[PDB]
PDB file of all heavy atoms in Angstrom:
ATOM      1  N   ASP A  80     -13.138  48.807 -88.527  1.00 13.27           N
ATOM      2  CA  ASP A  80     -12.311  48.442 -89.708  1.00 13.27           C
ATOM      3  C   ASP A  80     -12.346  49.601 -90.695  1.00 13.27           C
ATOM      4  O   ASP A  80     -13.191  49.572 -91.563  1.00 13.27           O
ATOM      5  CB  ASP A  80     -12.849  47.197 -90.428  1.00 13.27           C
ATOM      6  CG  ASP A  80     -13.226  46.040 -89.523  1.00 13.27           C
ATOM      7  OD1 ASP A  80     -12.320  45.507 -88.833  1.00 13.27           O
ATOM      8  OD2 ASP A  80     -14.437  45.696 -89.498  1.00 13.27           O
ATOM      9  N   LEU A  81     -11.455  50.578 -90.567  1.00 15.89           N
ATOM     10  CA  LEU A  81     -11.432  51.796 -91.436  1.00 15.89           C
ATOM     11  C   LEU A  81     -11.310  51.407 -92.925  1.00 15.89           C
ATOM     12  O   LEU A  81     -11.794  52.185 -93.759  1.00 15.89           O
ATOM     13  CB  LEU A  81     -10.293  52.722 -90.989  1.00 15.89           C
ATOM     14  CG  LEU A  81     -10.540  53.499 -89.699  1.00 15.89           C
ATOM     15  CD1 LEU A  81      -9.439  54.517 -89.490  1.00 15.89           C
ATOM     16  CD2 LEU A  81     -11.890  54.208 -89.708  1.00 15.89           C
ATOM     17  N   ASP A  82     -10.739  50.232 -93.234  1.00 16.66           N
ATOM     18  CA  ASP A  82     -10.649  49.648 -94.606  1.00 16.66           C
ATOM     19  C   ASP A  82     -12.038  49.338 -95.174  1.00 16.66           C
ATOM     20  O   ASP A  82     -12.129  49.256 -96.383  1.00 16.66           O
ATOM     21  CB  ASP A  82      -9.802  48.365 -94.645  1.00 16.66           C
ATOM     22  CG  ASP A  82     -10.234  47.273 -93.674  1.00 16.66           C
ATOM     23  OD1 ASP A  82     -10.041  47.457 -92.448  1.00 16.66           O
ATOM     24  OD2 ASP A  82     -10.755  46.241 -94.141  1.00 16.66           O
ATOM     25  N   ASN A  83     -13.052  49.115 -94.328  1.00 17.57           N
ATOM     26  CA  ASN A  83     -14.419  48.700 -94.737  1.00 17.57           C
ATOM     27  C   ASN A  83     -15.366  49.908 -94.695  1.00 17.57           C
ATOM     28  O   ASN A  83     -16.538  49.722 -95.005  1.00 17.57           O
ATOM     29  CB  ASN A  83     -14.917  47.551 -93.849  1.00 17.57           C
ATOM     30  CG  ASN A  83     -16.311  47.049 -94.192  1.00 17.57           C
ATOM     31  OD1 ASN A  83     -17.226  47.172 -93.386  1.00 17.57           O
ATOM     32  ND2 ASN A  83     -16.494  46.525 -95.392  1.00 17.57           N
ATOM     33  N   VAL A  84     -14.901  51.096 -94.292  1.00 19.42           N
ATOM     34  CA  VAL A  84     -15.774  52.289 -94.114  1.00 19.42           C
ATOM     35  C   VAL A  84     -15.288  53.429 -95.017  1.00 19.42           C
ATOM     36  O   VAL A  84     -16.124  54.068 -95.673  1.00 19.42           O
ATOM     37  CB  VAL A  84     -15.798  52.713 -92.629  1.00 19.42           C
ATOM     38  CG1 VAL A  84     -16.473  54.058 -92.441  1.00 19.42           C
ATOM     39  CG2 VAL A  84     -16.459  51.664 -91.753  1.00 19.42           C
ATOM     40  N   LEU A  85     -13.993  53.746 -95.007  1.00 21.66           N
ATOM     41  CA  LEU A  85     -13.471  54.950 -95.704  1.00 21.66           C
ATOM     42  C   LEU A  85     -12.989  54.550 -97.087  1.00 21.66           C
ATOM     43  O   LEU A  85     -12.704  53.381 -97.292  1.00 21.66           O
ATOM     44  CB  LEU A  85     -12.326  55.509 -94.873  1.00 21.66           C
ATOM     45  CG  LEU A  85     -12.759  56.264 -93.624  1.00 21.66           C
ATOM     46  CD1 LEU A  85     -11.581  56.447 -92.692  1.00 21.66           C
ATOM     47  CD2 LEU A  85     -13.383  57.607 -93.999  1.00 21.66           C
ATOM     48  N   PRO A  86     -12.831  55.483 -98.051  1.00 23.09           N
ATOM     49  CA  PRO A  86     -12.045  55.184 -99.248  1.00 23.09           C
ATOM     50  C   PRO A  86     -10.554  55.035 -98.886  1.00 23.09           C
ATOM     51  O   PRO A  86     -10.148  55.338 -97.769  1.00 23.09           O
ATOM     52  CB  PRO A  86     -12.327  56.356-100.202  1.00 23.09           C
ATOM     53  CG  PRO A  86     -12.741  57.488 -99.282  1.00 23.09           C
ATOM     54  CD  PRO A  86     -13.322  56.863 -98.034  1.00 23.09           C
ATOM     55  N   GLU A  87      -9.787  54.534 -99.847  1.00 21.57           N
ATOM     56  CA  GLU A  87      -8.337  54.232 -99.756  1.00 21.57           C
ATOM     57  C   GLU A  87      -7.581  55.525 -99.427  1.00 21.57           C
ATOM     58  O   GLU A  87      -6.645  55.496 -98.590  1.00 21.57           O
ATOM     59  CB  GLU A  87      -7.946  53.567-101.084  1.00 21.57           C
ATOM     60  CG  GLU A  87      -6.475  53.356-101.310  1.00 21.57           C
ATOM     61  CD  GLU A  87      -6.131  52.232-102.293  1.00 21.57           C
ATOM     62  OE1 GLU A  87      -7.080  51.660-102.930  1.00 21.57           O
ATOM     63  OE2 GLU A  87      -4.907  51.897-102.387  1.00 21.57           O
ATOM     64  N   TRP A  88      -7.989  56.629-100.054  1.00 20.20           N
ATOM     65  CA  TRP A  88      -7.354  57.963 -99.906  1.00 20.20           C
ATOM     66  C   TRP A  88      -8.355  58.916 -99.256  1.00 20.20           C
ATOM     67  O   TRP A  88      -9.499  58.914 -99.701  1.00 20.20           O
ATOM     68  CB  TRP A  88      -6.907  58.477-101.267  1.00 20.20           C
ATOM     69  CG  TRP A  88      -5.660  57.830-101.767  1.00 20.20           C
ATOM     70  CD1 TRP A  88      -5.571  56.744-102.593  1.00 20.20           C
ATOM     71  CD2 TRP A  88      -4.309  58.245-101.496  1.00 20.20           C
ATOM     72  NE1 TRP A  88      -4.253  56.453-102.846  1.00 20.20           N
ATOM     73  CE2 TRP A  88      -3.459  57.360-102.193  1.00 20.20           C
ATOM     74  CE3 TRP A  88      -3.741  59.259-100.728  1.00 20.20           C
ATOM     75  CZ2 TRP A  88      -2.070  57.462-102.143  1.00 20.20           C
ATOM     76  CZ3 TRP A  88      -2.366  59.359-100.675  1.00 20.20           C
ATOM     77  CH2 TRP A  88      -1.545  58.475-101.383  1.00 20.20           C
ATOM     78  N   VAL A  89      -7.914  59.706 -98.282  1.00 19.81           N
ATOM     79  CA  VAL A  89      -8.778  60.562 -97.415  1.00 19.81           C
ATOM     80  C   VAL A  89      -8.077  61.900 -97.180  1.00 19.81           C
ATOM     81  O   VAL A  89      -6.873  62.001 -97.440  1.00 19.81           O
ATOM     82  CB  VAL A  89      -9.096  59.873 -96.069  1.00 19.81           C
ATOM     83  CG1 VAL A  89      -9.942  58.622 -96.259  1.00 19.81           C
ATOM     84  CG2 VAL A  89      -7.842  59.518 -95.286  1.00 19.81           C
ATOM     85  N   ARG A  90      -8.836  62.898 -96.759  1.00 18.50           N
ATOM     86  CA  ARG A  90      -8.296  64.129 -96.145  1.00 18.50           C
ATOM     87  C   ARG A  90      -8.679  64.108 -94.670  1.00 18.50           C
ATOM     88  O   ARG A  90      -9.698  63.496 -94.336  1.00 18.50           O
ATOM     89  CB  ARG A  90      -8.781  65.382 -96.880  1.00 18.50           C
ATOM     90  CG  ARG A  90      -7.972  65.679 -98.131  1.00 18.50           C
ATOM     91  CD  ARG A  90      -8.085  67.137 -98.506  1.00 18.50           C
ATOM     92  NE  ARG A  90      -7.167  67.468 -99.583  1.00 18.50           N
ATOM     93  CZ  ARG A  90      -7.508  67.687-100.856  1.00 18.50           C
ATOM     94  NH1 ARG A  90      -8.769  67.624-101.252  1.00 18.50           N
ATOM     95  NH2 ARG A  90      -6.568  67.983-101.739  1.00 18.50           N
ATOM     96  N   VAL A  91      -7.807  64.647 -93.828  1.00 16.33           N
ATOM     97  CA  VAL A  91      -8.076  64.823 -92.376  1.00 16.33           C
ATOM     98  C   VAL A  91      -8.298  66.310 -92.143  1.00 16.33           C
ATOM     99  O   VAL A  91      -7.684  67.124 -92.869  1.00 16.33           O
ATOM    100  CB  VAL A  91      -6.960  64.271 -91.496  1.00 16.33           C
ATOM    101  CG1 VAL A  91      -6.810  62.779 -91.729  1.00 16.33           C
ATOM    102  CG2 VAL A  91      -5.650  65.018 -91.720  1.00 16.33           C
ATOM    103  N   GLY A  92      -9.122  66.615 -91.147  1.00 16.48           N
ATOM    104  CA  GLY A  92      -9.578  67.985 -90.889  1.00 16.48           C
ATOM    105  C   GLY A  92     -10.074  68.204 -89.474  1.00 16.48           C
ATOM    106  O   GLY A  92     -10.120  67.253 -88.673  1.00 16.48           O
ATOM    107  N   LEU A  93     -10.371  69.465 -89.180  1.00 13.85           N
ATOM    108  CA  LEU A  93     -11.048  69.924 -87.961  1.00 13.85           C
ATOM    109  C   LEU A  93     -12.304  70.657 -88.426  1.00 13.85           C
ATOM    110  O   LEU A  93     -12.223  71.347 -89.432  1.00 13.85           O
ATOM    111  CB  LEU A  93     -10.097  70.837 -87.178  1.00 13.85           C
ATOM    112  CG  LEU A  93      -8.859  70.186 -86.560  1.00 13.85           C
ATOM    113  CD1 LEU A  93      -8.030  71.215 -85.810  1.00 13.85           C
ATOM    114  CD2 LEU A  93      -9.216  69.067 -85.603  1.00 13.85           C
ATOM    115  N   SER A  94     -13.427  70.454 -87.751  1.00 16.06           N
ATOM    116  CA  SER A  94     -14.733  71.076 -88.068  1.00 16.06           C
ATOM    117  C   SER A  94     -15.275  71.675 -86.778  1.00 16.06           C
ATOM    118  O   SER A  94     -14.900  71.171 -85.710  1.00 16.06           O
ATOM    119  CB  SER A  94     -15.665  70.045 -88.630  1.00 16.06           C
ATOM    120  OG  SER A  94     -16.877  70.628 -89.110  1.00 16.06           O
ATOM    121  N   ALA A  95     -16.088  72.718 -86.861  1.00 15.71           N
ATOM    122  CA  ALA A  95     -16.823  73.233 -85.688  1.00 15.71           C
ATOM    123  C   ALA A  95     -18.117  73.906 -86.164  1.00 15.71           C
ATOM    124  O   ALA A  95     -18.242  74.197 -87.377  1.00 15.71           O
ATOM    125  CB  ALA A  95     -15.937  74.154 -84.896  1.00 15.71           C
ATOM    126  N   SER A  96     -19.074  74.070 -85.254  1.00 18.49           N
ATOM    127  CA  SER A  96     -20.361  74.736 -85.529  1.00 18.49           C
ATOM    128  C   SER A  96     -20.941  75.388 -84.266  1.00 18.49           C
ATOM    129  O   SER A  96     -20.568  75.021 -83.136  1.00 18.49           O
ATOM    130  CB  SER A  96     -21.320  73.791 -86.167  1.00 18.49           C
ATOM    131  OG  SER A  96     -21.784  72.841 -85.216  1.00 18.49           O
ATOM    132  N   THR A  97     -21.797  76.378 -84.510  1.00 19.03           N
ATOM    133  CA  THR A  97     -22.700  77.051 -83.552  1.00 19.03           C
ATOM    134  C   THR A  97     -24.120  77.035 -84.132  1.00 19.03           C
ATOM    135  O   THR A  97     -24.273  76.791 -85.358  1.00 19.03           O
ATOM    136  CB  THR A  97     -22.186  78.464 -83.293  1.00 19.03           C
ATOM    137  OG1 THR A  97     -22.174  79.169 -84.526  1.00 19.03           O
ATOM    138  CG2 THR A  97     -20.793  78.459 -82.712  1.00 19.03           C
ATOM    139  N   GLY A  98     -25.127  77.235 -83.281  1.00 19.47           N
ATOM    140  CA  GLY A  98     -26.546  77.157 -83.685  1.00 19.47           C
ATOM    141  C   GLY A  98     -27.291  78.350 -83.125  1.00 19.47           C
ATOM    142  O   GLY A  98     -26.765  79.457 -83.285  1.00 19.47           O
ATOM    143  N   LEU A  99     -28.412  78.112 -82.422  1.00 19.37           N
ATOM    144  CA  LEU A  99     -29.077  79.117 -81.555  1.00 19.37           C
ATOM    145  C   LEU A  99     -28.087  79.543 -80.466  1.00 19.37           C
ATOM    146  O   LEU A  99     -27.982  80.726 -80.194  1.00 19.37           O
ATOM    147  CB  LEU A  99     -30.352  78.520 -80.957  1.00 19.37           C
ATOM    148  CG  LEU A  99     -31.124  79.462 -80.038  1.00 19.37           C
ATOM    149  CD1 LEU A  99     -31.605  80.675 -80.831  1.00 19.37           C
ATOM    150  CD2 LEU A  99     -32.290  78.726 -79.367  1.00 19.37           C
ATOM    151  N   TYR A 100     -27.343  78.597 -79.913  1.00 19.70           N
ATOM    152  CA  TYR A 100     -26.268  78.856 -78.927  1.00 19.70           C
ATOM    153  C   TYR A 100     -24.913  78.831 -79.643  1.00 19.70           C
ATOM    154  O   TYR A 100     -24.792  78.292 -80.763  1.00 19.70           O
ATOM    155  CB  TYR A 100     -26.366  77.847 -77.787  1.00 19.70           C
ATOM    156  CG  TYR A 100     -27.688  77.869 -77.068  1.00 19.70           C
ATOM    157  CD1 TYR A 100     -28.567  76.809 -77.166  1.00 19.70           C
ATOM    158  CD2 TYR A 100     -28.059  78.944 -76.278  1.00 19.70           C
ATOM    159  CE1 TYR A 100     -29.774  76.799 -76.487  1.00 19.70           C
ATOM    160  CE2 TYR A 100     -29.260  78.949 -75.584  1.00 19.70           C
ATOM    161  CZ  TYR A 100     -30.120  77.876 -75.698  1.00 19.70           C
ATOM    162  OH  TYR A 100     -31.310  77.868 -75.059  1.00 19.70           O
ATOM    163  N   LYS A 101     -23.913  79.386 -78.977  1.00 22.39           N
ATOM    164  CA  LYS A 101     -22.621  79.713 -79.606  1.00 22.39           C
ATOM    165  C   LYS A 101     -21.474  79.556 -78.614  1.00 22.39           C
ATOM    166  O   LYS A 101     -21.699  79.490 -77.392  1.00 22.39           O
ATOM    167  CB  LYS A 101     -22.672  81.141 -80.145  1.00 22.39           C
ATOM    168  CG  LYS A 101     -23.139  82.179 -79.144  1.00 22.39           C
ATOM    169  CD  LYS A 101     -23.634  83.431 -79.825  1.00 22.39           C
ATOM    170  CE  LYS A 101     -24.197  84.476 -78.883  1.00 22.39           C
ATOM    171  NZ  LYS A 101     -25.584  84.826 -79.274  1.00 22.39           N
ATOM    172  N   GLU A 102     -20.283  79.513 -79.184  1.00 22.75           N
ATOM    173  CA  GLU A 102     -18.983  79.423 -78.500  1.00 22.75           C
ATOM    174  C   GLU A 102     -17.913  79.822 -79.520  1.00 22.75           C
ATOM    175  O   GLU A 102     -18.140  79.627 -80.713  1.00 22.75           O
ATOM    176  CB  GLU A 102     -18.754  77.999 -77.979  1.00 22.75           C
ATOM    177  CG  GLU A 102     -18.502  76.965 -79.077  1.00 22.75           C
ATOM    178  CD  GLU A 102     -18.754  75.508 -78.699  1.00 22.75           C
ATOM    179  OE1 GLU A 102     -19.469  75.285 -77.710  1.00 22.75           O
ATOM    180  OE2 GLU A 102     -18.266  74.576 -79.437  1.00 22.75           O
ATOM    181  N   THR A 103     -16.780  80.332 -79.050  1.00 22.74           N
ATOM    182  CA  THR A 103     -15.514  80.336 -79.818  1.00 22.74           C
ATOM    183  C   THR A 103     -15.087  78.882 -80.034  1.00 22.74           C
ATOM    184  O   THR A 103     -15.247  78.050 -79.105  1.00 22.74           O
ATOM    185  CB  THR A 103     -14.410  81.113 -79.096  1.00 22.74           C
ATOM    186  OG1 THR A 103     -14.110  80.386 -77.902  1.00 22.74           O
ATOM    187  CG2 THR A 103     -14.803  82.538 -78.772  1.00 22.74           C
ATOM    188  N   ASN A 104     -14.563  78.602 -81.219  1.00 25.23           N
ATOM    189  CA  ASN A 104     -14.015  77.287 -81.598  1.00 25.23           C
ATOM    190  C   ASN A 104     -12.566  77.522 -82.039  1.00 25.23           C
ATOM    191  O   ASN A 104     -12.221  77.306 -83.213  1.00 25.23           O
ATOM    192  CB  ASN A 104     -14.952  76.645 -82.607  1.00 25.23           C
ATOM    193  CG  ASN A 104     -16.272  76.248 -81.990  1.00 25.23           C
ATOM    194  OD1 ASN A 104     -17.350  76.640 -82.454  1.00 25.23           O
ATOM    195  ND2 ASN A 104     -16.209  75.425 -80.967  1.00 25.23           N
ATOM    196  N   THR A 105     -11.751  77.969 -81.093  1.00 23.82           N
ATOM    197  CA  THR A 105     -10.330  78.327 -81.316  1.00 23.82           C
ATOM    198  C   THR A 105      -9.469  77.065 -81.230  1.00 23.82           C
ATOM    199  O   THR A 105      -9.583  76.349 -80.241  1.00 23.82           O
ATOM    200  CB  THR A 105      -9.918  79.446 -80.344  1.00 23.82           C
ATOM    201  OG1 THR A 105     -10.929  80.464 -80.392  1.00 23.82           O
ATOM    202  CG2 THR A 105      -8.595  80.075 -80.704  1.00 23.82           C
ATOM    203  N   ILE A 106      -8.672  76.814 -82.269  1.00 24.29           N
ATOM    204  CA  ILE A 106      -7.585  75.798 -82.349  1.00 24.29           C
ATOM    205  C   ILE A 106      -6.252  76.539 -82.239  1.00 24.29           C
ATOM    206  O   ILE A 106      -6.016  77.395 -83.091  1.00 24.29           O
ATOM    207  CB  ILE A 106      -7.687  75.030 -83.679  1.00 24.29           C
ATOM    208  CG1 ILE A 106      -9.080  74.448 -83.896  1.00 24.29           C
ATOM    209  CG2 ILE A 106      -6.609  73.963 -83.784  1.00 24.29           C
ATOM    210  CD1 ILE A 106      -9.532  73.502 -82.801  1.00 24.29           C
ATOM    211  N   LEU A 107      -5.432  76.235 -81.231  1.00 21.63           N
ATOM    212  CA  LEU A 107      -4.123  76.885 -80.975  1.00 21.63           C
ATOM    213  C   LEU A 107      -3.018  76.026 -81.578  1.00 21.63           C
ATOM    214  O   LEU A 107      -1.947  76.581 -81.927  1.00 21.63           O
ATOM    215  CB  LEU A 107      -3.879  77.061 -79.478  1.00 21.63           C
ATOM    216  CG  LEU A 107      -4.669  78.170 -78.786  1.00 21.63           C
ATOM    217  CD1 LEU A 107      -6.139  77.838 -78.713  1.00 21.63           C
ATOM    218  CD2 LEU A 107      -4.154  78.385 -77.385  1.00 21.63           C
ATOM    219  N   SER A 108      -3.243  74.721 -81.701  1.00 20.83           N
ATOM    220  CA  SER A 108      -2.223  73.816 -82.272  1.00 20.83           C
ATOM    221  C   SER A 108      -2.891  72.571 -82.842  1.00 20.83           C
ATOM    222  O   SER A 108      -3.967  72.190 -82.344  1.00 20.83           O
ATOM    223  CB  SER A 108      -1.172  73.469 -81.258  1.00 20.83           C
ATOM    224  OG  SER A 108      -1.686  72.566 -80.310  1.00 20.83           O
ATOM    225  N   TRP A 109      -2.243  71.963 -83.826  1.00 21.15           N
ATOM    226  CA  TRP A 109      -2.733  70.722 -84.456  1.00 21.15           C
ATOM    227  C   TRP A 109      -1.554  69.958 -85.047  1.00 21.15           C
ATOM    228  O   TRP A 109      -0.821  70.537 -85.833  1.00 21.15           O
ATOM    229  CB  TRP A 109      -3.793  71.091 -85.489  1.00 21.15           C
ATOM    230  CG  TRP A 109      -4.405  69.942 -86.221  1.00 21.15           C
ATOM    231  CD1 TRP A 109      -4.571  68.671 -85.777  1.00 21.15           C
ATOM    232  CD2 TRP A 109      -4.997  69.988 -87.520  1.00 21.15           C
ATOM    233  NE1 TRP A 109      -5.221  67.926 -86.709  1.00 21.15           N
ATOM    234  CE2 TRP A 109      -5.499  68.708 -87.787  1.00 21.15           C
ATOM    235  CE3 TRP A 109      -5.158  70.999 -88.473  1.00 21.15           C
ATOM    236  CZ2 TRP A 109      -6.133  68.389 -88.982  1.00 21.15           C
ATOM    237  CZ3 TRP A 109      -5.784  70.692 -89.658  1.00 21.15           C
ATOM    238  CH2 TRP A 109      -6.261  69.400 -89.910  1.00 21.15           C
ATOM    239  N   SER A 110      -1.375  68.703 -84.645  1.00 19.47           N
ATOM    240  CA  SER A 110      -0.375  67.783 -85.224  1.00 19.47           C
ATOM    241  C   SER A 110      -1.078  66.498 -85.667  1.00 19.47           C
ATOM    242  O   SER A 110      -2.102  66.102 -85.067  1.00 19.47           O
ATOM    243  CB  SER A 110       0.781  67.522 -84.262  1.00 19.47           C
ATOM    244  OG  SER A 110       0.395  66.604 -83.251  1.00 19.47           O
ATOM    245  N   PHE A 111      -0.550  65.881 -86.715  1.00 18.87           N
ATOM    246  CA  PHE A 111      -1.069  64.616 -87.271  1.00 18.87           C
ATOM    247  C   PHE A 111       0.108  63.791 -87.805  1.00 18.87           C
ATOM    248  O   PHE A 111       0.993  64.343 -88.512  1.00 18.87           O
ATOM    249  CB  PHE A 111      -2.108  64.929 -88.348  1.00 18.87           C
ATOM    250  CG  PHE A 111      -2.614  63.708 -89.066  1.00 18.87           C
ATOM    251  CD1 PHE A 111      -3.728  63.024 -88.608  1.00 18.87           C
ATOM    252  CD2 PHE A 111      -1.959  63.227 -90.183  1.00 18.87           C
ATOM    253  CE1 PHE A 111      -4.191  61.900 -89.262  1.00 18.87           C
ATOM    254  CE2 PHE A 111      -2.431  62.108 -90.844  1.00 18.87           C
ATOM    255  CZ  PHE A 111      -3.535  61.441 -90.373  1.00 18.87           C
ATOM    256  N   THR A 112       0.102  62.497 -87.487  1.00 19.69           N
ATOM    257  CA  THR A 112       0.997  61.493 -88.104  1.00 19.69           C
ATOM    258  C   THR A 112       0.208  60.285 -88.592  1.00 19.69           C
ATOM    259  O   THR A 112      -0.665  59.818 -87.856  1.00 19.69           O
ATOM    260  CB  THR A 112       2.115  61.007 -87.173  1.00 19.69           C
ATOM    261  OG1 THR A 112       2.796  62.156 -86.676  1.00 19.69           O
ATOM    262  CG2 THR A 112       3.122  60.147 -87.908  1.00 19.69           C
ATOM    263  N   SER A 113       0.576  59.800 -89.779  1.00 21.38           N
ATOM    264  CA  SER A 113       0.022  58.598 -90.441  1.00 21.38           C
ATOM    265  C   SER A 113       1.167  57.722 -90.944  1.00 21.38           C
ATOM    266  O   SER A 113       2.051  58.256 -91.590  1.00 21.38           O
ATOM    267  CB  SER A 113      -0.886  59.001 -91.571  1.00 21.38           C
ATOM    268  OG  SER A 113      -1.525  57.853 -92.097  1.00 21.38           O
ATOM    269  N   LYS A 114       1.128  56.428 -90.656  1.00 21.70           N
ATOM    270  CA  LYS A 114       2.125  55.418 -91.108  1.00 21.70           C
ATOM    271  C   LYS A 114       1.401  54.231 -91.739  1.00 21.70           C
ATOM    272  O   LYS A 114       0.510  53.634 -91.082  1.00 21.70           O
ATOM    273  CB  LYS A 114       2.966  54.844 -89.967  1.00 21.70           C
ATOM    274  CG  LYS A 114       3.909  55.798 -89.253  1.00 21.70           C
ATOM    275  CD  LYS A 114       4.972  55.022 -88.460  1.00 21.70           C
ATOM    276  CE  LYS A 114       5.487  55.739 -87.224  1.00 21.70           C
ATOM    277  NZ  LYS A 114       6.505  56.775 -87.544  1.00 21.70           N
ATOM    278  N   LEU A 115       1.769  53.893 -92.960  1.00 21.39           N
ATOM    279  CA  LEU A 115       1.197  52.723 -93.662  1.00 21.39           C
ATOM    280  C   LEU A 115       2.348  51.793 -94.059  1.00 21.39           C
ATOM    281  O   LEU A 115       3.283  52.282 -94.734  1.00 21.39           O
ATOM    282  CB  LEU A 115       0.401  53.239 -94.859  1.00 21.39           C
ATOM    283  CG  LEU A 115      -0.236  52.159 -95.714  1.00 21.39           C
ATOM    284  CD1 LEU A 115      -1.428  51.541 -95.009  1.00 21.39           C
ATOM    285  CD2 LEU A 115      -0.648  52.729 -97.065  1.00 21.39           C
ATOM    286  N   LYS A 116       2.294  50.565 -93.561  1.00 22.05           N
ATOM    287  CA  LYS A 116       3.422  49.613 -93.667  1.00 22.05           C
ATOM    288  C   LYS A 116       3.012  48.288 -94.287  1.00 22.05           C
ATOM    289  O   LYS A 116       2.379  47.490 -93.596  1.00 22.05           O
ATOM    290  CB  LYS A 116       3.908  49.282 -92.256  1.00 22.05           C
ATOM    291  CG  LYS A 116       4.952  48.170 -92.174  1.00 22.05           C
ATOM    292  CD  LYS A 116       5.433  47.885 -90.773  1.00 22.05           C
ATOM    293  CE  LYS A 116       6.721  47.088 -90.741  1.00 22.05           C
ATOM    294  NZ  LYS A 116       7.287  46.965 -89.372  1.00 22.05           N
ATOM    295  N   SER A 117       3.486  48.032 -95.506  1.00 22.26           N
ATOM    296  CA  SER A 117       3.182  46.784 -96.257  1.00 22.26           C
ATOM    297  C   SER A 117       3.733  45.543 -95.534  1.00 22.26           C
ATOM    298  O   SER A 117       4.751  45.644 -94.869  1.00 22.26           O
ATOM    299  CB  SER A 117       3.711  46.883 -97.665  1.00 22.26           C
ATOM    300  OG  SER A 117       2.713  46.589 -98.622  1.00 22.26           O
TER     301      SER A 117
END
């Protein structure tokens, strides 16, 4: 129930990390759609 966990207004994102070990974290494309219907 995202209504019971998140605030009413949010930002969407992509995150990545490396530590002792590593990798490229390449994003070539990203699309997002959101629909809110009363």
Side-chain angles (χ1 to χ4, degrees):
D80 314 297
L81 285 188
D82 55 289
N83 180 244
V84 170
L85 284 165
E87 171 156 7
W88 284 94
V89 295
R90 278 203 172 106
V91 299
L93 292 181
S94 188
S96 72
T97 60
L99 180 63
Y100 302 112
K101 51 200 176 236
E102 70 201 19
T103 66
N104 291 125
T105 312
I106 307 302
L107 285 69
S108 74
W109 180 29
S110 77
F111 175 90
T112 307
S113 187
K114 294 198 209 280
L115 179 73
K116 172 179 196 172
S117 232

